[PDB]
Design a protein around this ligand. Structure first.
Ligand SMILES: Cc1cc2nc3c(=O)[nH]c(=O)nc-3n(C[C@H](O)[C@H](O)[C@H](O)COP(=O)(O)OP(=O)(O)OC[C@H]3O[C@@H](n4cnc5c(N)ncnc54)[C@H](O)[C@@H]3O)c2cc1C
Length: 353
């Protein structure tokens, strides 16, 4: 039995646990955060992402909890709506709860005898060549443990990644992009959806935009993507309401003015990083999946779905190369990296037609 340390019990980490569990590895997952089953909110799941769940027999489980989006609904500056179908049926996407997907994936990974969950454990440091990691439980005693394979599934700020990268003469490397994001809610109207549920709703503007995905509880979660330069200018409730009157006129009625002003100032806008690694593996000891390998901002694509495909492709290599990691890893890097727009920046011009 070969020993695997999966760093990160998020979306990709939990998925990968299931894939590896099928291959009779000894898998220990280490999640810094607490078990969410005791203790953004939406995502669009794609056809490609589905395939990965199906490969571990979770699809129908997760699909039943999801609301299908079969077209875009565009909200123009004037507050008018227009529908745009997806070309192919395979472009349909599914709105799913982030939290509950993570819950389901974790339970699925525990259904396996050879999987043990280690919550409230934060990788402080690791050694790739040495196959050793340094974790930290709540008891707060740095204990070091060895392993055969380290799977960096520890998200956009991967600690595993920080150890696999070299560190040049003068680090002229910006981490964050100039855009930030903020979540709002369109609540139900009369115990039902305040707009058309089976659409991805989009308020495209040039340098900023909002999107809305439906929830099972008959609300929509909004996400507003804006340069910090713009967020900076919205200091008061009056500023916010003014901004929304001017750029998202139909949104205020849907969200409600009070609710908007409350939720807008719960937190600063959340920053985002755009990174890609030259390689997703070290030797035969360490591989990166999900945002650890490629942190994809939503403007340029679909991070979860990409990470889920990471798992699928990795699993296909394992079949292909009979669990030989010396081969799977390097080939994984080579085959994934070359896998490269609903949320692009544009003005939407209303025509007479
Ligand atoms: C606003 C927004 C909207 C998005 N919408 C979509 C969408 O619609 N569709 C889509 O496909 N993608 C979407 N994405 C991308 C998607 O959220 C990510 O790409 C995806 O969650 C990556 O999954 P992951 O497992 O790699 O990382 P994560 O989900 O971030 O999980 C990483 C885990 O590692 C843990 N961890 C971190 N450091 C340590 C450490 N040192 N020790 C131990 N554990 C650690 C964290 O606690 C976390 O549980 C969106 C992203 C953003 C920011």
């Amino acid at each position: 039995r070969k020993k695997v340390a999966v760093i990160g019990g998020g979306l990709v980490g939990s998925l990968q646990a299931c894939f590896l569990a099928k291959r009779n590895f000894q898998i220990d997952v280490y999640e810094a955060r607490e078990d969410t089953r005791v203790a953004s909110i939406n995502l669009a799941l794609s056809h490609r992402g589905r395939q990965a769940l199906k490969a571990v027999g979770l699809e129908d489980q997760i699909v039943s909890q999801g609301i299908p989006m079969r077209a875009r609904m565009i909200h123009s500056l004037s507050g008018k709506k227009s529908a745009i179908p997806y070309g192919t049926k395979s472009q349909y996407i599914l709105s799913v709860s982030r939290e509950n997907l993570n819950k389901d994936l974790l339970t699925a990974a525990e259904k396996y005898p050879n999987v043990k969950m280690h919550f409230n454990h934060r990788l402080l440091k690791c050694n790739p060549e040495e196959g050793m990691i340094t974790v930290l439980g709540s008891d707060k005693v740095p204990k070091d443990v060895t392993c055969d394979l380290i799977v960096g599934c520890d998200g956009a700020y991967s600690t595993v990644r920080s150890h696999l990268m070299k560190k040049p003469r003068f680090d002229y490397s910006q981490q964050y992009i100039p855009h930030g994001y903020m979540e709002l809610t369109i609540p139900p109207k009369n115990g039902d959806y305040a707009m058309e549920p089976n659409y991805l709703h989009i308020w495209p503007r040039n340098t900023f935009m909002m999107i809305a995905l439906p929830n099972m509880n008959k609300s929509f979660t909004c996400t507003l993507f804006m340069p910090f330069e713009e967020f900076e200018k919205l200091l008061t409730s009056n500023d916010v309401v003014d901004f929304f009157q001017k750029y998202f006129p139909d949104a205020i009625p849907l969200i409600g003015e009070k609710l908007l002003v409350q939720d807008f100032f719960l937190l600063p806008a959340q920053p985002m990083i755009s990174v890609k690694c030259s390689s997703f593996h070290f030797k035969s000891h360490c591989v990166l999946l999900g945002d650890a390998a490629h942190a994809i901002v939503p403007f340029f694509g679909q991070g979860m779905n990409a990470g889920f495909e990471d798992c699928l492709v990795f699993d296909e290599l394992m079949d292909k190369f009979s669990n030989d990691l010396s081969l799977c890893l390097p080939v994984f890097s080579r085959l994934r990296i070359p896998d490269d727009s609903d949320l692009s920046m544009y003005n939407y011009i209303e025509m007479r037609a």
